[PDB]
Each structure stands twice: as C-alpha cells, then as structure tokens.
Amino acid sequence: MLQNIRIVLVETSHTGNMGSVARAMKTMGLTNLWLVNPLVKPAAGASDVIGNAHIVDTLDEALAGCSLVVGTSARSRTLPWPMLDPRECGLKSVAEAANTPVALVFGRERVGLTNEELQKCHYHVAIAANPEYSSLNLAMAVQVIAYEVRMAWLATQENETPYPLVDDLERFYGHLEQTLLATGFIRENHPGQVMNKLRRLFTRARPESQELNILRGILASIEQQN
Amino acid sequence: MLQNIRIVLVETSHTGNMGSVARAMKTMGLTNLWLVNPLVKPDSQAIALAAGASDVIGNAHIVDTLDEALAGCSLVVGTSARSRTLPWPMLDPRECGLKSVAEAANTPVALVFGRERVGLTNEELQKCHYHVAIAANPEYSSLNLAMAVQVIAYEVRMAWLATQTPYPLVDDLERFYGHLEQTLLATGFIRENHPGQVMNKLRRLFTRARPESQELNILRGILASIEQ
Ligand SMILES: Nc1ncnc2c1ncn2[C@@H]1O[C@H](CSCC[C@H](N)C(=O)O)[C@@H](O)[C@H]1O
Ligand SMILES: Nc1ncnc2c1ncn2[C@@H]1O[C@H](CSCC[C@H](N)C(=O)O)[C@@H](O)[C@H]1O
C-alpha cells in the first residue's frame, strides 16, 4: 500500500526541491516523506506531505523499519550490486509495501549518494538517462520512480510472508561481528571492511526471516566452542 | 530516431519551466523543442541553466500557432490530466512511447503540452490524434509541466532503447557446502545422519546469492577460524 512506500531524501539543500518532490509524490499518490538531515528547513501545493514528513539525523534511522531498501544513482560507485530498473523497482516496492515499509533513497543535488550510503541498499536503481547528461534533477528522479510505483500499484488494483527489517538484519550483523571477533577472524577495532564484504554478500542473498533464524542459530552454536 | 520527436509547449507562462523542460528532454535524449507563443522569453545563455538545456532552448523553434508546430507530422499526441468532454482515443505514456518511437523512425512526431494551470484548450486537444493522461492521484492529478514532460520523455526513451547465464562456480560452491556441513557437525548444530534440511535451507540461501570466488574465500576463512 502506497502509504508504506517511503521517499527518503538525503541532506537536500535547495528549498524549491522539497516542494517539487512533494508535488511529484502526491500526484502519484505517495505521501510518506522522510528527510535525512535536511540542510534547508521545512510554500507549495502539496503542503500536507511536507507537514507530515519524518525528519531524522541519520540514514540508518530512515531505513530501520523497512524490509526493502532501494538506492538511486545515475552511475555505480561501488562493487557490483543487485540492480533494478525503475519498472522492476516499482513492481518490487508495491509488492512489499503490502506488508512492510519500503525505503526509496535519493541523494543530494550535485553530489548524490556516497559509497557508504549506497552500501546500505538492497538494490540500486539507475534511470537509463542519456549517457552524456545522465543526472536528472532530484525531483524529476522522484517523479520517474513514483510514476513507475503507481503503475505497479494500479496493476495490483486491477481486480507472501514479510522480509526481515533492516533492524533484524542489523542484529544479525552485530551477532556476526561478535562471532568473528571471538574466533579471531577479525581484530579488535577492525575498520569494518570484512563486515562490509559479508554485508554485501548477504544483502545480495537477501535472507528470509527463517534463513536469518538459522544463521543466528549457527552463530550461537559456534560461540559455544568459544 | 529521437531528433524526430517534437516536444511542443503551448504558451508557457513561467520561465524556469522552460529550463526544466529542456533539462528533462536532454537527459532523455530529446532535443527538438518547439514553443508555440511562449508568454516568456527563454534566456538560454544563463549560467543558472543546466548543461545541455541551454542548447535545446537556443535551437528551439518559436512559432505563432499550434498548426505550425504540428506541420509535417503524421503523428500528434496531446497531453491532459483528464479530458472527458472529448471522445478522442487514449494512450497511456507507455503506449505513447512505443507508438512515437515507431513513427519517429521515419517522420516527425509531435507531443504537445499545455499552459501551466489551465493546460490545453479543447480546440487544441482536438488537433491531437491521441490524448495521454498520466495516471495520477484522483485528488491531485495535475503534474507540473516539466514533470509531465519528464514522464512522457522517459517512456519515449524506454521505447527507443528497446529498438537499439549459468553460475560458473558450482564446484567451488559445493566444496564450500561440504566444509560448511563439517563445521555444523563439529559444533553440534546438526547431528550425524541429519536428513539434510538445515543444509538445504543454507544451500538455497547461498546459491541464489551466486557467490564470487572472493566471497567463497572469506567464508572458507571463517570456517577455518572456527575450528581453531
Ligand atoms: N540517472 C539517475 N538514476 C537514478 N537516480 C538519479 C538519476 N539522476 C538523479 N538521480 C537522483 O537524484 C539525486 C540528485 S542527482 C546527484 C548527482 C548524481 N548524478 C547521482 O545521481 O548520483 C541523486 O542522488 C539520485 O537519487
Ligand atoms: N496527469 C497528466 N497527464 C498528462 N499531462 C499532464 C498531466 N499533468 C500535467 N500535464 C501537462 O502539463 C501541462 C500543464 S499542467 C495543467 C493542468 C491541466 N488541468 C491539464 O492537465 O490539462 C498540461 O497542459 C499537460 O500537458
């Protein structure tokens, strides 16, 4: 359901952009706006969407609670990542929004999302723009994504069981870390690079709740070896 | 071809919208901009204007009537959030993309957009062979001009792009499952002569992830550190 689909805006800084994003959302029937650390402070027509915008300081807080995280980027600035086109994105998002919150993440005008931020997404979506001019304006990008989302949703209004939330996955990663510290595989005050490798892997696998359960079972059993 | 797709703006009232529309075009590979009686004068040489937008505006055709904008086009499609007064046939934006690209292969095509606030008159919509409504929120169904152009141009580019493998490491993945089973046996998480259920769940999990050899090396390293 459309109310479960979050438009997440990271550190947006041009005050007109927020209004444009809000109008785009509303026209597509989206309403659930999240602002990660806005450099401009909350003048348009879709006032409601912005008045009811969640604000948070960090990206993690916009993501915890979602089962599906999708980041947007014109080009890759990470190792190979699972990719969706905007159509596929719309389908997958509408499919999961029935039960759980979905985060569609958008970066800053001019500089976009960082590598670090992009690594907290389960999928990357690149709109297939003209290669010489492949960056759309933030609000435009939202328009495209939201339009595909509405297509998919409309299709469902044409007459399974949830995924773990980012929260659960994070608990599993904590458990994984402590296990690796225990066995000595990673060191005290590790820079988090091995953990990032493993997160890349499991993000691509995208564990279901029972799979996650089994994994933590295994971790638990290992720790009783010491 | 994309240069044969005419974006036609009738009587644009805010500049800023002209820049935005120009940028939407450029990012989707469109360049053929037509202005019918702009109620504004597009600057072009502004530094504020994005990349590619300036050239699209500078090379725009400026005419006095819609008919000139439609001259030489076999296919004319107009846009409107809703047009119940008229019995004109509808396309959704996807169909419009397809139909436009097929035609633009050989003949100019016009995609027409209206004034902000009031859109196109019914006389002007009557000059279009088809109408496209972007399916929207029934309560809030009018897109911003530039956003409507963006959507239509996106579907056009998708339609145009349309006109332009076994997992290699199965053996290694197997070796990994073998060692994984030995580890699970050694920690007691599975028992001798297990019916292979936990293992199967694990294999579904890891196999759909299509592990890279790097990742298999890390996983193996972890298994090895456990025994220690
Ligand atoms: N071609 C494209 N595909 C997917 N998202 C895009 C996009 N162009 C712009 N966006 C969205 O709009 C925001 C501002 S564009 C920022 C610069 C850079 N082109 C980038 O996307 O990474 C981006 O962070 C992204 O969320
Ligand atoms: N949902 C939608 N479908 C098709 N075109 C739209 C649209 N929303 C806005 N537009 C375009 O943007 C222009 C200005 S918006 C003006 C709103 C007007 N009520 C109308 O749609 O006709 C319109 O002329 C139209 O070309």
Q: What is the DSSP string of B137-149?
A: -TTS----HHHHH
Among A78, A124, A138, name the best residue to mutate to test ligand 1's pocket (greatest count of ligand atoms within 8 A of Cβ): A138
C-alpha–C-alpha distance, residues B11 and B112, integer Å: 11
Tell me the domain boundaries of chain B: 1-164, 165-228
Residue B5 is classified by DSSP as E
CB atoms closer than 10 angstroms to residue A40? 13
What are residue B125's DSSP bridge partners?
A: none
d(CA B8, CA B12): 10
Calpha distance A20→A146 (Å, rounded): 13
* C-alpha span between A176 and A170 (Å, rounded): 10
What is the CB neighbour count within 10 angstroms for residue A20? Answer: 22
Count of residues making up chain B:
228
Any idea what the Cα angle at residue B92 is, between residues B87 and B94, rounded to 5°? 150
Tokens of A152: 């998919």
φ/ψ region of A110 (left if φ > 0, alpha if ψ in -120 to 50, else beta) reads left
Rounded Cα gap, residues B75 and A43, in angstroms = 39
How far A154 CA sits from the closest chain B CA (Å)?
9
Question: Which ligand 1 atom sits nearest the alpha carbon of residue B27?
Answer: 1
| Look-up of token digits 């003949």 | B107
Q: What share of chain B is helix, strand, coil (3-state, %, to 5)?
A: 45, 15, 40
B216 lines ligand 2 (CB under 6 A): no
Q: Which of A140, A207, A222 sits opposite B205 (nearest CB)?
A: A207
What's the Rg (C-alpha) of chain A? 19
State the helix-helix crossing angle for B197-208 and A193-205, rounded to 10 degrees.
100
- Tokens, residue A85: 């086109």
Distance CA A43, CA B14 (A): 17
H or E stretch including B34? Answer: strand B33-36
Residue A199, chain B, CB below 8 Å: the answer is no
A72 a known binding residue?
yes
- Three-class SS of residue B153? helix
CA proximity to B15, closest of B111, B166, B83, B116: B116
**CA gap B77, B100 in Å, rounded:** 9
Residue environment code for A193-223, b if the CB has 16+ CB neighbours within 10 A, otherwise e: ebbebbbbbbbbbbbbeebbebbbebbebbe
- Secondary structure, 3-state, chain A: CHHHEEEEEECCCCHHHHHHHHHHHHHHCCCCEEEECCCCCCCCCCHHHHHCCEEECCHHHHHECECEEEEECCCCCCCCCCEECHHHHHHHHHHHHCCCCEEEEECECCCECCHHHHCCCCEEECCCCCCCCCCCCHHHHHHHHHHHHHHHHHHHHCCCCCCCCHHHHHHHHHHHHHHHHHHCCCCCCCCCHHHHHHHHHHHHHCCCHHHHHHHHHHHHHHHCCC
Resolution in A: 2.6
CA dist B111 and B70 (Å) reads 9
The pair phi, psi for residue A55, each rounded to 5°, is -110, 135
φ/ψ of B20, rounded to 5, equals: -60, -45
Residue B150 C-alpha from the chain's centroid: 9
Q: Which pair of tokens denotes residue A185?
A: 């595989």
Burial class for B87, CB neighbours closer than 10 Å (0-12, 13-18, 19+): exposed
Q: Which A residues, 114 through 133, put their C-beta within 8 Å of a C-beta on chain B?
A: 127-130, 132-133
CATH architecture of the domain with residue range A159-226: Orthogonal Bundle (1.10)
Best CA proximity match to A7, nearest among A19, A20, A25, A23: A25
Q: Can you tell me the distance from the alpha carbon of A207 to that of B13, in angstroms, rounded to the nearest whole number?
A: 52
Cα separation, A109 vs A135, in Å, equals 9
Do the chains contact at A139 and B147, CB–CB below 8 Å? yes
Q: Ligand 1: does its nearest atom lie under 6 Å from the Cβ of A71?
A: no
CATH 1.10.8.590 is held by the domain B165-228: yes
How close does chain B come to A66, measured CA to CA in Å?
A: 21
For an interface test with B, the pick among A21, A28, A47, A212 (most B C-beta atoms closer than 10 Å) comes out as: A28
With beta carbons less than 8 A apart as the criterion, state whether A76 and A109 touch. Answer: no
Separation CA B185–CA A122 (nearest Å): 32
User: For residues B213 and B175, is the Cβ–Cβ distance under 8 A?
Assistant: no
Q: How far apart are CA B131 and CA A119, in angstroms?
A: 42
Q: Does the Cβ of B146 fall within 6 Å of ligand 2?
A: no
Residue with tokens 């409107």: B80
- Confirm or reject: Cβ of A134 under 6 Å from ligand 1: yes
Q: Is A178 near chain B, with CB under 8 Å? A: no
The number of angstroms, rounded, from the C-alpha of A62 to the middle of its chain's C-alpha atoms is: 8
Q: Are B69 and B105 in contact (CB under 8 A)?
A: no
CA distances from A38 to A101, A119, A137, B19 (A): 21, 21, 17, 25
A148 with A86: CB under 8 angstroms? yes
Q: Say how many CB pairs under 8 Å bridge A and B.
A: 128
- Technique used: X-ray
Q: Which helix (H) or strand (E) holds B56?
A: helix B53-58
Q: With an 8 Å Cβ cutoff, is A188 touching chain B? A: no
Q: How far is CA B153 from the centre of its chain?
A: 8
Token pair 């990663």 in the structure block, residue = A173
Give the other-Cβ count within 10 Å of A52's Cβ: 10
Alpha-carbon distances, residue B179 vs A197, B202, B226, B227 (angstroms): 20, 13, 12, 11
Q: What is the assigned CATH class of domain B1-164?
A: alpha beta
Could you tell me if the CB of B111 is within 6 A of ligand 2? no
Spatial strand order of the sheet with B109-113 comes to B61-63, B33-36, B5-10, B109-113, B75-79, B130-132, B90-91
- A1-159 CATH, one of 1.20.120.530, 1.10.490.10, 3.40.1280.10, 3.40.640.10: 3.40.1280.10
CB neighbour list of residue A3: distance below 8 Å, 6 or more residues apart: A31, A32
Measured CA to CA, the distance from residue B173 to residue A18 in angstroms comes to: 47
Number of C-beta neighbours around residue B128 at 10 A? 25
B interface test, pick of A1, A144, A178, A223 with most B CB neighbours within 10 Å: A144
Q: Say if strands B61-63 and A123-125 run parallel, antiparallel, or are unpaired.
A: unpaired
Angle at B183 between CA B181 and CA B189, to 5 degrees: 80
- Nearest CA to B86 out of B121, B120, B122, B138 is that of B122
- Between CA A125 and CA A148 the distance in angstroms is 12
